[PDB]
Write a protein that binds this ligand. Structure first.
Ligand SMILES: O=C(N[C@H]1CC=C(c2cc3c(Nc4cc5ncsc5cc4F)ncnc3s2)CC1)C1CC1
Ligand SMILES: O=C(N[C@H]1CC=C(c2cc3c(Nc4cc5ncsc5cc4F)ncnc3s2)CC1)C1CC1
Lengths: 287, 278
């Protein structure tokens, strides 16, 4: 049973982000004395959707899912309270390059591994949970840069488009609950992580992107996009191309991706992951 | 809402980790989720395990050992939790050849996190009382963050060294925490000079406590006077003089604010490396 958190116990409320998913602000819990974050939106249908997401996080708890701490549900305030993620989202880590000039490969591969473990867990639930809104903005990073998947506003029990498979452009119950949506998002996320590039950066119009994706086009695979020094480069390219395959049948399960990723992740010495985080903090601090 | 049920056959590569009164702990790999897990496994016995699993399910929080599911089958009963790669606080404090210098910032962060954890339990509506805190039950994750474990005798409101004398209670946990704090700052066994646990109970019953002097707590300990005050109030003979965990957090917060985030990570790497070299 999910705790209910009185709105007045959230002190020093301060805004962080606003998106389609909702508004996110930080706070400190007056009794637990920890930093928390809270996604908040009057209405009546809107309050049901917020409650819908909160129940889903409560149920989907796992080591790589954003931990829900409670719902603030009062006439003055509706909102989901979660642990506060001090290192923001994967999107700023990838694309704020003046702030993070170097993101070592061991950390990037660990992030990819942990995303896959999170989504795999969702897909292994009774009944399977489908996220359907994976994006780098929705992968949050905790104090030591471990993954927490966020934003379940579009999850379902079994530039905003760049992660969406083409068969979902015009949604029908032929894919409405397809098990192959998330892996396609993950393939694009994987390309984004290994390249530190905006997918389809060269296309000014997002409707042009959908038309091109509908025809089978994808973010470029070459040495400029995916540099030669990517560890296990050819294996990662395979993983990307099969994950975003035009034919949904032809895309793997997250289990099979994990089976392939495990020996790759074992080639990095464990301390190397911490080395990578320390390098991020030390250079950032010096700036 | 509903705690998962984990079929025993999904636990691959079971291996022994430790044995205690709480039960036997084994490590494993979950076949479908592809993560390492730990499992505490054994009719009255079946009721207690389910009670503990239910309490962990309900007491979830950032410094509480995360429960992943229950194994409840005719051949196997056991609680499945995340795997803690760095063992317990007890090993970190007392394995002095393997861990020669345990950075002060990290020890204070551990104390802060235990207090945040127990503070949460006491604020739960209704409050949860742990009643078996000990350094053996403070587990350490991959970056040495605290996860409090072993809720087998927690209650809704050497195994004796953490027990207040009136127990031979709403002030139990704070007394255990005071001894834990003394242990963390001294890296000494409480009542080190004592062959028999009945000697401890007799001396604690008389108001005696682990020694506080230059040998146990050297003068160069950071914030020595503040910590000693916190310890002595926490194990006070009269339970009414023991503070709440809120007050412990009030004492610790300004101490933890003096440390840079990089120093914690350096201390963590130093500890990770020392384990591997052993
Ligand atoms: O864009 C920038 N900064 C980002 C920096 C920090 C951000 C964070 C968001 C969240 C978060 N969101 C959240 C998701 C959620 N999903 C379901 S319920 C729920 C409740 C939540 F609060 N949850 C926990 N910690 C954090 S940190 C986004 C803005 C500029 C500065 C570079
Ligand atoms: O003792 C020795 N070494 C230790 C090194 C590593 C150990 C670990 C234990 C646990 C653990 N236990 C656990 C508690 C629990 N509480 C409620 S349910 C539940 C389920 C659990 F699995 N949980 C997760 N990770 C780990 S790592 C203990 C032995 C050497 C000296 C002889």
């Amino acid at each position: 049973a999910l705790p209910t958190i009185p709105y007045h116990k959230l002190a020093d409320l301060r805004y962080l982000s606003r998106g389609a998913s909702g508004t996110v602000s930080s706070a400190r819990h007056a009794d637990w004395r920890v930093q928390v974050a809270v996604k908040h939106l009057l209405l009546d249908s809107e309050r049901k959707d917020v409650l819908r997401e909160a129940e889903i996080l409560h149920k989907a708890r796992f080591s790589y899912i954003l931990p829900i701490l409670g719902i603030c549900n009062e006439p003055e305030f509706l909102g989901i309270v979660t642990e506060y993620m001090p290192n923001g989202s994967l999107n700023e880590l990838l694309h704020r390059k003046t702030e993070y000039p170097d993101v070592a490969w061991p950390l990037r591969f660990r992030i990819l591994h942990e995303i896959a473990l999170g989504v795999n867990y969702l897909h292994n639930m009774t009944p399977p949970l489908l996220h359907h809104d994976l994006k780098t903005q929705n992968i949050l990073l905790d104090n030591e840069f471990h993954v927490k998947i966020a934003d379940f506003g579009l999850s379902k029990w079994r530039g905003t488009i760049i992660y969406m498979p083409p068969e979902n452009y015009e949604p029908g119950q032929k894919s409405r609950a397809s098990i192959k949506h998330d892996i396609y998002s993950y393939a694009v996320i994987t390309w984004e992580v290994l390249s530190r590039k905006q997918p389809f950066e060269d296309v000014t119009n997002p409707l042009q992107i959908m038309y091109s994706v509908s025809q089978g086009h994808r973010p470029v695979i070459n040495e400029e996009s995916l540099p030669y020094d990517i560890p296990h480069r050819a294996r990662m390219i395979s993983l990307i191309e099969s994950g975003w395959a035009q034919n949904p049948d032809e895309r793997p399960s997250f289990l099979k991706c994990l089976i392939e990723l495990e020996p790759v992740l074992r080639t990095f010495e464990e301390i190397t992951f911490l080395e990578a985080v320390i390098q991020l903090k030390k250079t950032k601090l010096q700036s």
